[PDB]
Point group: C3
Chain length 329, copies 3
Amino acid sequence: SLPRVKVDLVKPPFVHAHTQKAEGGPKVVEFTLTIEEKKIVIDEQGTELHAMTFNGSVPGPLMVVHQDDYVELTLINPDTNTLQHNIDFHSATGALGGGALTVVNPGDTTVLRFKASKAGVFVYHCAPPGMVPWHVTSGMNGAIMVLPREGLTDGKGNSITYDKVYYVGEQDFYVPRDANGKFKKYESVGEAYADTLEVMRTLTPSHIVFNGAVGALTGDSALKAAVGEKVLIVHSQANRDTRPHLIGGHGDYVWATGKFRNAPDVDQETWFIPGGTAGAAFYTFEQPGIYAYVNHNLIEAFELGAAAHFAVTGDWNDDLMTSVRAPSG
Amino acid sequence: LPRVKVDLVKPPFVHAHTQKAEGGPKVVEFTLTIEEKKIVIDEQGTELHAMTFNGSVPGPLMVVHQDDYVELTLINPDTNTLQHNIDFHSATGALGGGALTVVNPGDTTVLRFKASKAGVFVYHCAPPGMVPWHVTSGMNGAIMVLPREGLTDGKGNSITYDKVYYVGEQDFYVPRDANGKFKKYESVGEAYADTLEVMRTLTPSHIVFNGAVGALTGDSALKAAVGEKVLIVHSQANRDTRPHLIGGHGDYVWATGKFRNAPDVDQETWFIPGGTAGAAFYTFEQPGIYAYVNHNLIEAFELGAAAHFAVTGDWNDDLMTSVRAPSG
Amino acid sequence: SLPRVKVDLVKPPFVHAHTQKAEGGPKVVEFTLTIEEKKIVIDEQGTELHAMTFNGSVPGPLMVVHQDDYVELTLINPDTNTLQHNIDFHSATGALGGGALTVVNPGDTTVLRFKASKAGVFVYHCAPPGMVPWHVTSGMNGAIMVLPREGLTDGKGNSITYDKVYYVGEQDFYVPRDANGKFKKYESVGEAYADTLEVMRTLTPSHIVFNGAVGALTGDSALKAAVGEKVLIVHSQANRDTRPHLIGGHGDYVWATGKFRNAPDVDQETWFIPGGTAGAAFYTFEQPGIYAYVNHNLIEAFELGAAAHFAVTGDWNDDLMTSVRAPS
Ligand SMILES: [Cu+2]
Ligand SMILES: [Cu+2]
Ligand SMILES: [Cu+2]
Ligand SMILES: [Cu+2]
Ligand SMILES: [Cu+2]
Ligand SMILES: [Cu+2]
C-alpha cells in the first residue's frame, strides 16, 4: 500500500536518475539484476578471465534509495550460466544480508525485500556457500547508496548538494601464470578454479583495476568535471584494502567508513577504505586540467592498473599555483 | 587500597565483572602461567609449537576499571625451554612491563601498573631478539579498562551490554617441505630457522579465531537472542583485520579501541590495525545463523578467519522478507 | 608583494627553525631542494641501493609554513645525475600537485609557487611520467607541515604547545636477490630497473626502515627527550601502510589522517597512517629510560628494520609502574 517506483539501472561509473532530498514519504523501490558469466579482457596485453557479473559489468551497478525506503530486488540466473549464485546486501539486517534467501541455480529467479533502515554507502556481493571469495574476486560485487531523507550534511549543521556523482568500483583479480610468466586461458569457468585458488592463497593480486580493466576510466572514458562543480566519488572494494587519492586535489568531505550519520573528515590528501566497505568523498574543483585518481600504493596504481583520470574545463587560478621559472638550463 | 583476586576463564568467555565500578580504586590480582605446547590448528591435522599465557590462544581477557591498579604474577615453569615476559599497551614505562618481567624456566615475577587510560589494549610477550616469533606463536591477549561509570554513546547517554565476547585473531607462519605438506618438529627450538623464513614473506599459512579453523563454529558458536545487547572485543597483536557481522552491523564501534573517543555508528565493516584491540556494540533484531569474518574473504574462508553466531527469537518480516522463493 | 623569508633546511629527523603561532600576516617562504642520486648502505650486512634523494637524505627534509602562506620552491637537478625528476605536493591544488610544471632533466632548474590553503602534515614525492613507483620507493619522498596560524589545539578549543618536533620518514625498499638469497649489486642505477620492477610486483619489500637504514635512529642516533617534555612525532609513508606504536608510551593526541582542523583521537596505543599520507602524534613523557618506536607489524619492525629508540632522562614514577618482585 506504499507508492511503488521502478529504477532503470545504468553501467558504471554513471548513476541512475535520483533526487538528493526525498520527494514524499517512504517508497518501495523495484530493481532487477540479471547474472551474466562471461570472458572479459582486463589489460593491454590481452589477458582474459571468466568474470561473474551482475548486469554485465564489473563492478555491478550503483542502486540509490533514501533511508526507510524498502528495496525490492528481482535476481535472475539465466539457464546459459553454469554456476549457483546469490546476493548479500551489507545495508540489510538478517539471513546473511539476503544470502540465505536468494540461492538461485541456472534457470531460477528470486525476489527479496528489505528495509533500508541505515543511511550510508554499502557493498553488495555474491556469497554462495563454499565458494565465496572466488565469486567476489571474479567481479561479482557492487554498491548501494542510501541517502538521508533530507540529503547530505557537512556533519556541522549545514546542508550540502553535489552537482554529479560517479561510482568507482575497485577489483583485485588473481590470474594464474605458467613457467614463462604469461597469463593462462581456460575453455570453461570451471577449469580456472583450482589454479585460481593457488594464487588467492598467496594474497597477491595479478591485477587491481577500476571499472573492470587497466585504463577503463582514461582516454575517451575519463570522468568529466568543471571548475566550481561539486562532485561526489563513491568508491567500493568488496575484498581488499585501498587508499584513494585525487592527484592535484583533496577530499573536502570524506566518509571513509561510508556512513553519513557520522561527521566527515575534512581537508583529506589520502583516505582509507577497508576491504568489505564503500566510502564517499565530496570535492569542489578549483583548477582545470588532467587529474589522476589512484590507489596511493603506487605499485598497485601504475604497475597493476588502479588508476583513473579526470578531464576538467575552466580557467587557471594563478593565486593557487604558478610556475615562476619554467624548467630550463 | 582494597584487594580483589580474579578467576580467569578460556576465551571467548570473560571473567565475572561489573560495567560500573563499586567503591573507589582497587588493586586487582591476576596470575598467568606460561605454557609451551603442541596444538592442532586445522582439519588436515597441521601442528604448531604454540607459546601461550594460561594455555590458550589467545590469552584470557583481563577486566578492570580506569585508575584501578593491576598486580600480575607471571609464572614460567621449569618444563618450558624458553625465556618469556609480558608487555601491556595499557601500561606506562619499561616497554609496557617487558623490561621488568624477563622470566627464564623456573622463574616467577610480580608487576604492578596503574590503569590510567580507558579502552581495550593488546598484551603480548616481547623477549629481546625473539619478539615477532613469540607473538605469531599465539603469546598475546587483551585487557579491558572500562570507565568508572561504564560505557556511553559519546553523547551523554549510558549504554549497557547483556554479554561480552573476546575474539583473538592469530596469524600463524607454518613451514612446508618441497611437496607443499606442513612440517612437524620434535622440539620448539628446531622450528625457528624455517619459521623465520616464512615470516620474512609476510604471508601467513593460517589466520584463525581462538586458536584454530572452526574454533567458534558448530557446538562452539557464540549464543545470542533477538533484543540482546552484545559487546565484541577483537584483538590482533601483529596484522591488520577488518571485522564484519554477516546480516548485522556495528551500532556503536570504537575501531581504535579507546572509549573516551566518540564511537562510529551504523558500521558495515570496521578496521583494527596490527597492534590494537577494538570493540563493537550490537543489538540483534533478527534470528538465525550469522557469520563474523575478517572481510578479506580469502583470509576468512581459505585461511580460517571465520566464526558463527546462533541467535534465537522471532523473524521480523518488516526488516526482510522473501517475496518469491528461488525457482524456475 | 607580501614579505619574503628564506629557510635553511636540516637533515631529518630534526626540523628547521619555525614558530608554532605565525608572527604577522601571510609570507612567501623560499626553500631550495637539490636532487642527488647516490649509493647508500641500508642494513648491517652492507646491502647497497641506488637511492634517489631530495637534498641527499632519505627521507627528504621536513618543510614548515603556516596556513595561507605561499611556498616558493627552487628545484635543482645537477648535470652529475642521470634521470628526469619533478615534485608533487599533496598540500597544493592543481597540475598533479606541481608534478606537471616541475619536470627537470639533468642540468635543469625550475621554480614553483603554491598557496598552502589547508592545515596539516602532507607527503611530497617525485612523480615522473611512466617511472612514479620506482622513484618514490628509491627514497624520493619527504613531507611538509602547514601549521594553523594560531598553532595546534585539542578538539575542544584549548591551545597546545610542543617543546620538540621530530620527523620519521618510513621507507619500503625492493632490492633484488639471487636464488641462494644474497642481495644483488649494480654498476649504474639504470641496470637495477628491470630486476627491481619484478620485486615491486610481488608487493613484498626486502626492507622497511626509518631515516634510510636499519638502526638509523638507535644508539648514538636515538631521539632524545626528558620526563615532562611535550613531543610531536610527524610520520610519513608515501607508498605503503604503517601502524606506529611507542613501546611504553601512548598517543595523547593523534591526527591519524594528518589534517589539524579535525579533532584528534585520544589515548591511542597504535595509530594507522595509510600509504600516501603523513600523520602526527603528540605525547608528554611520564617515565624515563629506553623507549622503542615501531611499526606494530613486529615482523616489519624487528626482522625488516622499521624500529627506532628514544633515550629519556628523568625520575622513575613508582605509582605508574613498579616491580613488586624481580625475576628469580
Ligand atoms: Cu556468484
Ligand atoms: Cu560482505
Ligand atoms: Cu614468550
Ligand atoms: Cu606491542
Ligand atoms: Cu625522481
Ligand atoms: Cu602522491
